[PDB]
């Protein structure tokens, strides 16, 4: 019911040391450096129906102040893809889910993109591990 | 520290069949299906929260809140916390709130867009 991704993305993210949750658009939250952040969560069929085509070869890379990687890589990192700012909607964390069989030639295993700001990286990355 | 009282009131709302939470505005509350930080202040004497004129008048409206017992102008110490975020909860001694209904100890600064999400959820 789309929130099956949301709960998805808490699983994953409570797996990596975050304080994660859901709450019913359909919202879910992150603990970093201390503070509460909004995630907003797209899940998209294909690459293109997310403009992540020729995005998936580039992460992780930082445009326009946001980092943009697979949520499962901590390797060292310009416009940025077209719905992805109005998807933001006011919160500073995007998720992003494409079916893994697209994700993972390239690395991504779990099927998620994380656009984050590049001010959270720091912390984002002092929460794994 | 004062996150005992962040707790009780996180239990207190709770049992009255909310969704609340303490932030590992450190208190959070669902109203309508939105999220809402929660001011949370604790005062020794009615005095010490400008709450002593209050306490004979809840639950009244001043100033587009509604302010009430947990179970016309607002102070301007209570403008000044409520500043910020958007629902204020002062705890006092319930000693103090008891003989006016305030068994808890808890008074609740309320938004008026909020009082009927407030009231549906209980």
Redesign the interface.
Known sequence: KGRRYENELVELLKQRGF?AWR??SS?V?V?LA?Q?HRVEVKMRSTPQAASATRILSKLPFSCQGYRVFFLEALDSQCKLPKNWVRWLNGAHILAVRLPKRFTSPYGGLTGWIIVLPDTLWDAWRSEMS
């Open positions: 304080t709450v019913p919202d939250r603990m201390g509460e």
